[PDB]
């Protein structure tokens, strides 16, 4: 065995563990989610596991979807000098075209044999795994300050008397047993002798700190396009209440969509409809209020 | 909240020393004023003085011998049916220091 | 919060020096008032005076020899069942400087 604990400022190591674990957790959660936002009229007719596509797109490798046996299996694809042949690395096994491939972008609208590359972002300047590191430390220390604020927001009622058995019988039989009408000696024995340590310099501070945590989440959120935007259009709470500057959050949402524009180039080739929409739906009540067809009653209940 | 009193102390310690108030010699002496203990504490004779000066003031006397009886009288008949604070007799030695 | 007291200190150090309170010579002496330690600390004899002047006041005496007994008495019987602050005896040397 080996044991000799520090003190009870162990909490001052537990506090910094909460901050450190919050940064690690929020960082890898936020990129645990971020490669699924778009999902684009999900599997109309096309054999793509779009989850495996979007995970590949957020490590910035240019995937290439084409035909394999007329059914659109993904492949990897790493002034205008045109690409034609299957020179690139190919991830499937025997489903390779073994024939004339092409990029279907500008050779014509809708004619050439399909192997179209899809960028994550049309013009690439900085990776957004750096922006997610940029705010999560700032977010980490505001989560530190919230946790440190509510950890010292606890309150005792200090009794103050010369020690051995004068005031103990008082609080036992007449405060925590709830008793009104306790009788005492005239020796100033509650003339502000019992005192309260309060932290009312802490609870007005508490709510404003939560609002700073909240709008910093929102200021990370609208950067990476994930937004509450369309419902904010129909709710009429459009500007300076949701302090987000709508023209910037509809801006950063749009860059990721027109990065995945070459799926429309593919969609024009084989005669089908694939639009890169932007997912904001969460179900069992939204699907109920949009239909209210009695077959949807036998589906849910 | 309730603990030991001080009338009960010197009553019990004086009844430890052979005294009584009901059947003292052989006759019924409950009504006789020179025998029950409350008169012995208000008169504050030699006897109660000895038991206070041994159990309460265990190592004290004042300067004179006429003032010292006055102080011990004015202490022990102000506080007969009062209380005790520090929970045990021969352990409220706070009395000796406030002396 | 609880640590060492001061009654327990001089009780344990006086019982280190061969004394006892129950079976002292051979007869049962629990009830005999001149043997148990609380009376030796309230009377504050030569013996407790020696052990306080060696373990608590390890290099001190006051000016006179009649006041100095009064100060050491008025210290050690105010603080018998009190407490200790700096967590170790022979390490509350804060007592010697506040002396």
């Amino acid at each position: 065995r080996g044991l000799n604990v520090e003190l009870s400022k162990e909490i001052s190591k537990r506090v910094v563990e909460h901050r450190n674990r919050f940064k690690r957790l929020m960082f890898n959660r936020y990129l645990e989610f971020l490669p699924l936002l778009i999902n684009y009229t999900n599997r109309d007719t096309v054999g793509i596991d779009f989850i495996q596509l979007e995970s590949a797109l957020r490590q910035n490798i240019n995937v290439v979807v084409g035909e394999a046996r007329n059914k659109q299996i993904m492949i990897l694809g790493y002034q205008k000098r045109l690409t034609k042949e299957d020179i690139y690395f190919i991830v499937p096994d025997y489903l390779i075209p073994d024939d004339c491939l092409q990029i279907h972008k500008l050779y014509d609208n809708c004619m050439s044999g399909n192997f179209v590359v899809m960028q994550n972002k049309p013009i690439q300047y900085n990776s957004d795994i750096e922006i997610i590191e940029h705010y999560t430390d700032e977010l980490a220390e505001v989560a530190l300050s919230r946790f440190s604020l509510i950890m010292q927001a606890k309150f005792s009622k200090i009794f103050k008397s010369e020690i051995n058995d004068e005031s103990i019988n008082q609080l036992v039989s007449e405060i925590y047993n709830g008793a009104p009408f306790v009788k005492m000696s005239p020796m100033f024995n509650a003339d502000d002798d019992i005192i309260d340590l309060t932290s009312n310099s802490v609870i007005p501070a508490l709510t404003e700190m939560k609002r700073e945590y909240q709008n910093k989440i929102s200021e990370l959120s609208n950067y990476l396009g994930i937004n509450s935007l369309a419902v904010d259009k129909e709710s009429g709470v459009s500007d300076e209440e949701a302090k987000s500057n709508r023209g910037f959050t509809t801006s950063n949402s749009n860059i990721y969509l027109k990065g995945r524009e070459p799926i429309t180039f593919l969609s024009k080739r084989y005669g089908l409809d694939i639009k890169p929409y932007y997912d904001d739906e969460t179900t069992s009540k939204i699907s109920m209020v949009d239909t209210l067809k009695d077959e949807s009653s036998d589906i849910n209940g | 909240r309730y603990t030991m009193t001080l009338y009960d102390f010197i009553k019990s310690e004086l009844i430890k020393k052979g005294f009584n108030e009901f059947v003292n010699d052989n006759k019924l002496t409950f009504y006789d004023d020179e025998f029950q203990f409350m008169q012995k504490m208000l008169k504050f004779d030699k006897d109660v003085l000895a038991i206070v000066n041994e159990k309460v003031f265990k190592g004290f006397s004042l300067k004179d011998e006429l003032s010292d009886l006055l102080f011990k009288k004015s202490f022990t008949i102000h506080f007969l049916d009062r209380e005790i604070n520090r929970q045990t007799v021969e352990a409220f030695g706070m009395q000796v220091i406030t002396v | 919060r609880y640590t060492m007291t001061l009654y327990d200190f001089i009780k344990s150090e006086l019982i280190k020096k061969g004394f006892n309170e129950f079976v002292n010579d051979n007869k049962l002496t629990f009830y005999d008032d001149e043997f148990q330690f609380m009376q030796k600390m309230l009377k504050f004899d030569k013996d407790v005076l020696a052990i306080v002047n060696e373990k608590v006041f390890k290099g001190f005496s006051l000016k006179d020899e009649l006041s100095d007994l009064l100060f050491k008495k008025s210290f050690t019987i105010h603080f018998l069942d009190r407490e200790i602050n700096r967590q170790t005896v022979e390490a509350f040397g804060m007592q010697v400087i506040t002396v």
């Binding site: 051995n164 058995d165 | 030991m4 009960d8 102390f9 019990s12 310690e13 009844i15 430890k16 159990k55 929970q87 045990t88 007799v89 021969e90 352990a91 | 009654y7 008032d33 148990q36 609380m38 009376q39 018998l80 069942d81």
Partner: peptide
């Protein structure tokens, strides 16, 4: 209910417990 001390009597037992508290006298 209505906690009453219906006896209120006289005693003949004696006490000087040479001890700091009730607790140390129990010890």
């Amino acid at each position: 209910t209505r906690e009453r001390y219906t006896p209120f009597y006289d005693d003949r037992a004696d006490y000087n417990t040479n001890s700091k508290s009730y607790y140390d006298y129990i010890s």
